[PDB]
Structure formats: C-alpha cells, structure tokens
Scaffold this active site. Structure first.
Site, mmCIF file in Angstrom:
data_model
loop_
_atom_site.group_PDB
_atom_site.id
_atom_site.type_symbol
_atom_site.label_atom_id
_atom_site.label_comp_id
_atom_site.label_asym_id
_atom_site.label_seq_id
_atom_site.Cartn_x
_atom_site.Cartn_y
_atom_site.Cartn_z
ATOM 1 N N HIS A 79 0.990 -1.209 0.063
ATOM 2 C CA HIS A 79 0.059 -0.008 0.031
ATOM 3 C C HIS A 79 0.971 1.120 0.003
ATOM 4 O O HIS A 79 0.521 2.177 -0.677
ATOM 5 C CB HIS A 79 -0.794 -0.047 1.215
ATOM 6 C CG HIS A 79 -1.879 -1.215 1.218
ATOM 7 N ND1 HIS A 79 -2.370 -1.617 2.285
ATOM 8 C CD2 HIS A 79 -2.248 -2.119 0.372
ATOM 9 C CE1 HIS A 79 -3.151 -2.732 1.963
ATOM 10 N NE2 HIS A 79 -2.995 -3.099 0.568
ATOM 11 N N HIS A 238 -9.217 -1.756 -4.749
ATOM 12 C CA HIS A 238 -8.224 -2.028 -3.659
ATOM 13 C C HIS A 238 -7.195 -3.138 -4.579
ATOM 14 O O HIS A 238 -5.910 -3.030 -4.423
ATOM 15 C CB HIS A 238 -8.540 -2.748 -2.425
ATOM 16 C CG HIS A 238 -7.457 -2.834 -1.612
ATOM 17 N ND1 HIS A 238 -6.892 -1.852 -0.986
ATOM 18 C CD2 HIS A 238 -6.675 -4.107 -1.469
ATOM 19 C CE1 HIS A 238 -5.936 -2.210 -0.302
ATOM 20 N NE2 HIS A 238 -5.752 -3.468 -0.647
ATOM 21 N N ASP A 242 -3.092 -2.659 -4.924
ATOM 22 C CA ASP A 242 -2.406 -3.490 -4.757
ATOM 23 C C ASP A 242 -1.142 -3.825 -6.137
ATOM 24 O O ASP A 242 -0.110 -3.851 -5.723
ATOM 25 C CB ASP A 242 -2.925 -4.713 -4.525
ATOM 26 C CG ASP A 242 -3.459 -4.834 -2.851
ATOM 27 O OD1 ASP A 242 -3.128 -4.092 -2.052
ATOM 28 O OD2 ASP A 242 -4.396 -5.767 -2.791
ATOM 29 N N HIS A 265 -0.476 -10.860 -5.030
ATOM 30 C CA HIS A 265 1.036 -10.600 -4.970
ATOM 31 C C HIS A 265 2.005 -11.448 -5.472
ATOM 32 O O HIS A 265 2.963 -11.088 -6.170
ATOM 33 C CB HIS A 265 1.270 -10.309 -3.477
ATOM 34 C CG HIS A 265 0.281 -9.355 -2.721
ATOM 35 N ND1 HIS A 265 0.179 -8.189 -3.050
ATOM 36 C CD2 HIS A 265 -0.636 -9.593 -1.500
ATOM 37 C CE1 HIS A 265 -0.903 -7.486 -2.345
ATOM 38 N NE2 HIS A 265 -1.292 -8.305 -1.519
HETATM 39 C C1 LIG Z 1 -6.971 -7.996 -0.483
HETATM 40 C C2 LIG Z 1 -6.042 -8.947 0.074
HETATM 41 O O1 LIG Z 1 -5.372 -9.332 -1.295
HETATM 42 C C3 LIG Z 1 -5.063 -8.579 1.014
HETATM 43 N N1 LIG Z 1 -5.661 -8.304 2.219
HETATM 44 C C4 LIG Z 1 -5.577 -9.524 3.133
HETATM 45 O O2 LIG Z 1 -4.896 -10.482 2.640
HETATM 46 C C5 LIG Z 1 -6.519 -9.264 4.597
HETATM 47 C C6 LIG Z 1 -5.953 -9.998 5.522
HETATM 48 C C7 LIG Z 1 -6.455 -9.865 6.931
HETATM 49 C C8 LIG Z 1 -7.459 -8.842 6.873
HETATM 50 C C9 LIG Z 1 -8.085 -8.734 8.184
HETATM 51 C C10 LIG Z 1 -8.531 -8.443 9.286
HETATM 52 C C11 LIG Z 1 -9.514 -8.448 10.434
HETATM 53 C C12 LIG Z 1 -9.051 -9.113 11.796
HETATM 54 C C13 LIG Z 1 -9.820 -9.077 12.948
HETATM 55 C C14 LIG Z 1 -11.173 -8.446 12.725
HETATM 56 C C15 LIG Z 1 -11.436 -7.572 11.538
HETATM 57 C C16 LIG Z 1 -10.566 -7.831 10.381
HETATM 58 C C17 LIG Z 1 -7.716 -8.077 5.948
HETATM 59 C C18 LIG Z 1 -7.432 -8.303 4.562
HETATM 60 C C19 LIG Z 1 -4.347 -7.359 0.667
HETATM 61 O O3 LIG Z 1 -4.689 -6.112 0.488
HETATM 62 N N2 LIG Z 1 -2.980 -7.244 0.285
HETATM 63 O O4 LIG Z 1 -2.296 -6.094 0.059
HETATM 64 ZN ZN LIG Z 2 -3.881 -4.425 -0.237
#
Ligand SMILES: C[C@@H](O)[C@H](NC(=O)c1ccc(C#Cc2ccccc2)cc1)C(=O)NO
Ligand SMILES: [Zn+2]
EC number: 3.5.1.108
Length: 300
Positions: A79, A238, A242, A265
């Site tokens: 990010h 989003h 990424d 990723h």
């Molecule tokens: C969109 C996906 O590709 C990735 N995001 C995740 O892998 C991810 C992992 C864990 C959480 C979380 C959480 C959470 C934990 C407790 C309570 C509420 C939310 C959110 C996104 C990401 O954004 N990579 O940059």
């Molecule tokens: Zn992300």
C-alpha cells in the site's frame, strides 16, 4: 521542461500497527539522492538493514508483499509503494522500527496525504521509465497477469467471487491515469477479507492488527463495517491499488498497461520477474521535453 526524478521535500513520520503482526510501528519517510529508488530500512536493528524495494528482494507473497535481505524482513509494502508510485516518488528512504509497514486505514489514502503534506522535491536528473515494448503474460490455474504495450499507464483488474455482494459491473474496473486521478479514484480503496478467511488467519496468529477500522470485512451475505464503502467498486479498486504497489517493485514508473484476472501479490511478482528476464519486451526511456511524454505528474 524535463520530466525529473522526485523525492520528498521534508521528513515525515507516521505511527501505526502492522496488519498481520499487530505490532506498533514508527514509519519515517526521508528524502533520498537521485537513482536511490525506494529503500526500506529496519532502524530497530543494529547495524541498520537496508532493503531496496526491488523485485529481486521480494520474499514471501502468500498474504502481502514482503521484502527480505538475509533473514531480515519488511512485511506488507504494497500500500505504501502504491502511494509512492501514484505520486511519482522515485527516491526515498522508508525507515521502520518493526518488520511490518503500518496498515493505517487499510488504504493508500493516509500515505498519499502524508507524502503530499511533506511536499515533493524535483531533483536534477531525468526520470527513468520502463516502457513495455512487447506483451508479457503469466498464468497459474485460472489466474492471469499481463503487460501490454500502451502509450501511458493503465491498470485493468477483474475479480471473481461467487457471492451476493459481488455481482454486476462492480467486479471489473479499468483505470487510465491520463484522465483519472490515482488520489481521488484509487488511493482510498481499503483492503478486505471474507470473514471465514479472516478467522482462519487469526487462528494462525496472522491478521493480529486487523479490525473494521482498517479493513472491509465481508461475511456470507454482507459488508459488516457499519459505515459502508468508499467506492461502489471498492474491492476491485483495492486490487488495482495492490497491483500498482506490486508493479512499483520494478524500480521505475511504467509506460504500459497491466491487466489482472484474479491476480495477487504472488502472480504480480511472477509477472515482474518474467518481464525483467525478457529484456526484448522492455526499455528504459526518459523525457527531456515533458510535452512529448504520455505520463504527467502533479506539481511538486
Ligand atoms: C485484499 C487482499 O489481497 C489482501 N488483504 C488481506 O490478505 C487481508 C488479511 C486480513 C485482514 C483482516 C482482518 C481483520 C481481523 C480481525 C477483525 C477484522 C478484520 C484483511 C485483509 C491485501 O490487501 N494485500 O495487500
Ligand atoms: Zn492490499
């Protein structure tokens, strides 16, 4: 007027928590000399370990993009790198007091605001771009990531979730940065997860810093965040955010188009590695006359 390399005008600091580690972390963005690129620095270590934000230093890519040098890691760089790419920052030192970049609000918004608050400095060297000359693709099962020659910078992405929240035209988006602002239309898009997947991550002591304040949580039928979405198509935007951050591991702004289908990723990194190895598919270009350039940047 020459398209120049950019760095930060002033040092700026941020505090936050790592999404996966749950660890409190201090972030410092500092100006850097011409041709340094983006360099992460683990300042909690003695000696300080520097890790250039380059494809060759990418470690694990199972959840977030990680940089590694020896057995020293910098987790979740995408990010912050997306914000750097979006604002055309060529050179900067990113200091961290812990292994993971703070998640902030789960988007690139707080980083783009912090960078613009400090201001940008045009430097006395031409900005180098990587221009896609030939198509390069990578696939793995039903996932695909492609680079296409294109006079400018465009990112297309498509997600495929068989879920009540993910229907209609909100599952694909294309952003052409000649007419669209990274800041207004991509930067605020937050990270997300499905509730069952997040439960799994928490059982494995991952997602320790996650909450509804830094991530969109989706259960079997709805968005659980009480305050709703920032974009009708926030999820796919989003994924675009990424991809822009992951693509910035090339070390230079791209002149070309990226198309992703269920990419993440890991496949993004595979695409960069295939591009880099296929030297006939790309070249380094500069613009000594900004009027001939297909990419434009905001005032510093
Ligand atoms: C969109 C996906 O590709 C990735 N995001 C995740 O892998 C991810 C992992 C864990 C959480 C979380 C959480 C959470 C934990 C407790 C309570 C509420 C939310 C959110 C996104 C990401 O954004 N990579 O940059
Ligand atoms: Zn992300």
């Amino acid at each position: 007027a020459m398209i120049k390399q950019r760095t930060l005008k002033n040092i700026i600091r941020a505090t936050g928590v790592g999404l996966h580690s749950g660890e409190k972390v201090y972030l410092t963005l500092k100006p850097a000399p011409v041709d340094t690129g983006i360099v992460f620095s683990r300042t909690d270590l003695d000696p300080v370990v520097e890790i250039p934000a380059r494809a060759e230093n990418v470690g694990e890519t199972t959840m977030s993009t990680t940089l590694v040098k020896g057995d020293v890691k910098v987790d979740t760089v995408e990010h912050l790198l997306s914000a750097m790419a979006g604002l055309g920052i060529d050179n900067a030192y990113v200091e961290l007091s812990a292994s993971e970049v703070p998640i902030m609000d789960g988007s690139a918004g707080p980083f783009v605001f912090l960078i613009q608050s400090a201001g940008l400095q045009e430097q006395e060297a031409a900005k180098k771009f990587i221009r896609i000359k030939r198509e390069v693709s990578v696939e793995e099962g039903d996932k695909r990531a492609v680079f296409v020659p294109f006079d400018g910078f465009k990112v297309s992405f498509e997600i495929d979730f068989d879920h009540p929240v993910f229907r209609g035209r909100t599952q694909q988006a294309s952003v052409d940065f000649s007419s669209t602002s990274f800041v207004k239309e991509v930067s605020r898009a937050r990270t997300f997860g499905f509730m069952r997947d997040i439960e799994y991550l928490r059982s494995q002591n991952l997602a320790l810093g996650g909450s509804v304040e830094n991530a969109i949580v989706v259960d079997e039928n709805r968005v659980l965040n009480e305050d709703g979405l920032r974009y009708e198509d926030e999820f796919v935007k989003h994924k675009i955010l990424d991809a822009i951050g992951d693509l910035y591991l090339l070390g230079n702004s791209l002149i070309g188009e990226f198309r992703g289908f269920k990419s993440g990723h890991a496949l993004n990194n595979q695409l960069l590695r295939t591009l880099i190895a296929d030297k006939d598919a790309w070249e380094v270009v500069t613009f000594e006359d900004a009027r001939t350039a297909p990419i434009s940047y905001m005032r510093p």
